[PDB]
Amino acid sequence: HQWQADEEAVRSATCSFSVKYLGCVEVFESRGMQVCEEALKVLRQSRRRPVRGLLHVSGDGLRVVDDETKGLIVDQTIEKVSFCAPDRNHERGFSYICRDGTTRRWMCHGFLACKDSGERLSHAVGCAFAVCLER
């Protein structure tokens, strides 16, 4: 069912679900998965307001199409970002880091799953990269 649809989802251009892209914050590491567990909190403080969109884990980079504006916000790529990283709070929050090469510094973006399950997006992304290097 779920995986029976997520199997070809990443292969297409949408293997995730509604998300809460808070924005982007600065970090000082970009060499660990725990770095995202902290950034997610920073964006939860203030300034960076969350957005209700639709994360589409595509094998050629993620894409968050707003579900209230459809103007898109995250036109980045999976192979472009340093490396993904979940959390250890409630598995309802994920984030990715992106150092220099486009920001001239370490900048990690954070977001949260509006589905609350830790499978419709988590495991989905964990399979995206596995297919990204298929060739």
């Binding site: 998965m33 192979e79 472009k80 490396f83 990283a85 220099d100 090469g101 964990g126 990269f129 290097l133």
Partner: peptide, 11 residues
Amino acid sequence: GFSNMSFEDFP
């Protein structure tokens, strides 16, 4: 606890 591997390895 995962991370992409098909990265282009940025400087």
